[PDB]
Amino acid sequence: WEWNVTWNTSNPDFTKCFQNTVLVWVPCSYLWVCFPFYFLYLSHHDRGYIQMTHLNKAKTALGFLLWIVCWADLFYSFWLAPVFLVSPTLLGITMLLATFLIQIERRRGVQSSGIMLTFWLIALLCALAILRSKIMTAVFRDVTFYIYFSLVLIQLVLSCFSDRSPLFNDPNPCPESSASFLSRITFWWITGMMVQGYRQPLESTDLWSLNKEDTSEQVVPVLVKNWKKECAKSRDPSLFKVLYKTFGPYFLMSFLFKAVHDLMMFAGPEILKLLINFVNDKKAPEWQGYFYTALLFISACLQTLVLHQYFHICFVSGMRIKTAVIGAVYRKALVITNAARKSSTVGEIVNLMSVDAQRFMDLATYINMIWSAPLQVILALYLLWLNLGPSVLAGVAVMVLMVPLNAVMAMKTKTYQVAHMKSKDNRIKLMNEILNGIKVLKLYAWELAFKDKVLAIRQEELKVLKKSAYLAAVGTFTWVCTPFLVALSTFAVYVTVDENNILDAQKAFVSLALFNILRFPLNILPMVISSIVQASVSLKRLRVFLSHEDLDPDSIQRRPINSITVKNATFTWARNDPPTLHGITFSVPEGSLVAVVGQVGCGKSSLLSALLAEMDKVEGHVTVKGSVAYVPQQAWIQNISLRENILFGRQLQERYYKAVVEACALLPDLEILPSGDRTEIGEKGVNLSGGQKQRVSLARAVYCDSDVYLLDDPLSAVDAHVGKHIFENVIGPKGLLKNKTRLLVTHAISYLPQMDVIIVMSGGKISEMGSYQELLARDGAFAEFLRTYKLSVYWDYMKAIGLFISFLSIFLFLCNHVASLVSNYWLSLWTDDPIVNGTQEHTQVRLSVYGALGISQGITVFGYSMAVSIGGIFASRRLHLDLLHNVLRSPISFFERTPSGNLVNRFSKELDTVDSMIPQVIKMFMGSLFNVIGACIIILLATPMAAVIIPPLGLIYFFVQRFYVASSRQLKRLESVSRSPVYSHFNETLLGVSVIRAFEEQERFIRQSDLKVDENQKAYYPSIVANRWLAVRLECVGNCIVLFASLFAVISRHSLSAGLVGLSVSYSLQVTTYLNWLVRMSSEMETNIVAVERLKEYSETEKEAPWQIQDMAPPKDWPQVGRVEFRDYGLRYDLVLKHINVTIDGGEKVGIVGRTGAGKSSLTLGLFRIKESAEGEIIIDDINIAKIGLHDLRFKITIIPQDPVLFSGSLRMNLDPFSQYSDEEVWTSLELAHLKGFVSALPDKLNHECAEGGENLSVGQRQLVCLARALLRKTKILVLDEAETDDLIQSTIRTQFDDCTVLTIAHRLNTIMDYTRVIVLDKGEIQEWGSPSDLL
């Protein structure tokens, strides 16, 4: 080995000794160190044995021949040089290990081998090096090497194909367990779903099944066993030891991958330095440059692959951790004791299964960086120290200064997040009031007053939004300025400290790239530490939960079908609490009806709990015989259909089910319910009354067909007749359970004489049990008891911002881009200056221009960021105003017809998406896009002839981005949807655990929780593999960019300078992260901007007639006398109102009578123009209503509706939202409304803060407040809608409103009789038109 023929030569040939020693020791050596380790995996992991195939044999036969050929060399050598003996024998022996290895891999079930692939690849490269040397040298021993190389190449090609699957069916399988090594490395096996997801929108059944190891049925038992072993071995069992003993061995493979990734990441800058030296070192061979470029490419590709495999390992381990923790928590919760369960909140345990398990899932990613981040940083620092000197300390002095500052920013906006949120809550509250009370507002035309309050709350919100906006600007400013800041600081210090310090390309750009690989190892440290602390508290929470005690099954001697036996048994609800049932003894024979009798808190329900092993048995002997059906006091209802509630996971028997349903008198309940017995009962579905829930619980118990029934007050909530019917057909001796041992807890005497045995107790003690007649004859405790009683959406958003602001932001951001680019170009020009008299010709003016360029970059970064901040706030204001106007201008038919509920999330969730997320997303997406464009242009500018690589790589990027965004924003939705049922099922199980355990159906519910967690994992796993697929494709694109940039710089290093090549390579190295985040941000934008599209709704939705016409406005006293005339009125709704020709004279009391379905109420809607007249000419006095603007008439006519709607705020704002009427008028109207006494009583006087809907006020008061509103209006036309205070409101409407014309729609004839001229409506027609005297 000497440098003349290997390094400094036109023809670089490895020396003969090097060829025969190191190039042969490398591959043979690889298999020798891996062989032992590989038995661990081959042994621990097995999948059967693969059959005898031609491929496997072909590989084995070539392994035999290859060994022979290599030993044939030893034979010829035997037929001087020491290397001609040991090397052939070593190669033959490692070859014999290779063929044995494919043999054992067949035995252990391996379709494709990564070892048997990397090993052949390394051997091939070594053979290639010797091959080239041997063909450049030119029979005797050469031909043996050619045969060896050809066989090795064919072996390598064979090793790529995947063998047949073993005899270990698998519908919709996961191709991970069947794909070959190359597909697993490149993650190609998911591209199928990627293309298919782009064409056919994914559903829950298209998702692949889970591999056997990820199923909860294979990860929960191992954790359960390990935790049991630790618990039985122990003081204070530790969950962390269990965790790292159970899933640690699979996790430790991440360590190697992380170390290799770190080393390969650092290998980049070293090769960059070598290339910068090469371009500066003219008169050097081109072979060195091409070797350096190939080294860069191979290192980058290998680092990408290893890192992405590391990512997959960590995510799979986290998924297993989550699944196992979920399963163990479920089983523990099903086992733990009531005493230990009551202390912890139910919501606490649900949080235990949600937030702590999710934190454990996410922790697996940032746990290796506990050592990767420091070492990286340290190593990077050392390299930087090797490069420049102590001055670099000042260069990083600001990076470490950004870690706290940025943190301080985030925490700050969190407080802002708390402020904004608070105001938003108020806003939505107010909006909710308007949404459920839009009827009253339109009637009084108070819409604009409420719009003003909404705008005031919006101003309050936008103040905090403006402050957060200004804070966000500097956060972006620092992020973009960091690179320039570190470069300028370190370079200025380096130049100023000593004039002999020469700034070369290697001394500027290598340290510049080391700064880029320093940003990440340092900025993630706070996140890592915070996640570790949260995971530690989660470990504490899980450990204390999993160490809880449990109920004792031994307490009850459950025996297969003297039925219930208790002797001298005392039970507790806790270990230290006193007994609740002291010294209980009783024997219940088979098929006997026993009633527990006592007062409240006696211990009746405790007896049934004790028979189910729910109480803590401190002493005694209980021998319940046969299956037990428990009807609890608090009915537990599953959210499944009523049929499956009664069935309870049991085979449906139509005759038995139909005998059970009516015997519980559940037939009326089935009839009222919409779908019958298929209705979704429970908290989530249709709510049921308590009696119905008790009925369903009893029906479930009766269907379960147990021999022993424990009925803890099944008839508490059912009525007396229903209860007697139930007892007759179910519990009584002539019911369904005639031969069943029934034990009932009751406090009702009605069925007591029919009971075979009455167990009467007092204070948890057996007190003279016996039969009813005998107990009555004894006249003791029982007698005492008885005696007790789409590109256009982007343009729309730009218009909402305004064209000027958007254009200015784009221009300033382009200015930032050009400033950064010219900063880089200035650095390149600066690094190329010659050295005269031992110092650069120019070094102060270059620093000044560098500083000026960077300061300009910083000011424009802070500027355009502030622009979009103001723009975003402007757009939020304009969009909210437009949406509010469209909503309030729409007719009532819109509110009635629209799904009531889709407006609320539009005002709350989508508006929140607009004002906060959209500006941040547009900022970071635009930044990433122009970072990519800047990398491309600085590559193309420095090397003009590099435009041939842009088209293919752009096509690859476009295809990958299209497929990923389309197929990932759907997988995320699938996973989100699937997550909720797990926590819902845990809530159901937690709520019904006593019933679950009593029926002994805990195994079925354990299996059910298996399915839901597996379903969630089936959608979560493709998402992370999708991220990996993005990752590999985009890093391949970036590595191709790096390779082509370096290649095109090396091919023309002469017409180029060192600094230009350095800058090109540094930016090409950076471009990969920018590309990845550009795709991720584009996906974010695509699913985010649609909010604006759904906020631009109701833009054309038919609106009401204009509120103010102002061309045909009425006079101030429009209702001069109040002469109403319905001239052929017809109201569309086919026609509810038809042929209405009536005349109500001014100041004449008129009422409207009719049955349900008539046009009584619709007639009022005619007066106020709620629905446009299909055919009609209603005219008040001498003016048509349809011509008048809505507000005008709605202000000149008043209505007292069915249910008065009192809005949140003061009483004065309820009476006069506009505050138009003076305080004296309000006081007079309130006094005239029989409310002066009450209104003077509130401490806040007229400013009494009434809650949502006036909950604090009574219904009578709210009605009188509505009457006060009508009285304060002082209008000549008033309408009344009648449904205790009726006497008061009727007298008040008869007191002073006699001057005004009053229409009255009352469902009661008593009040209408007083009003003359009654109009009767049969089906919209005027049945009778005359006074009540003419009516009778």
Ligand SMILES: Nc1ncnc2c1ncn2[C@@H]1O[C@@H]2CO[P@](=O)(S)O[C@@H]3[C@H](O)[C@@H](CO[P@](=O)(S)O[C@H]2[C@H]1O)O[C@H]3n1cnc2c(N)ncnc21
């Ligand atoms: N191997 C690696 N080496 C270098 N860095 C790596 C990395 N892997 C991950 N990153 C991260 O990718 C981003 C790289 O920077 P960019 O891609 S140039 O821009 C960021 C990014 O686009 C997104 C968030 O990406 P992010 O996860 S937060 O963090 C950084 C970086 O830490 O928004 C931008 N961004 C970040 N902060 C701000 C801000 N205050 N104002 C405006 N835009 C901001």
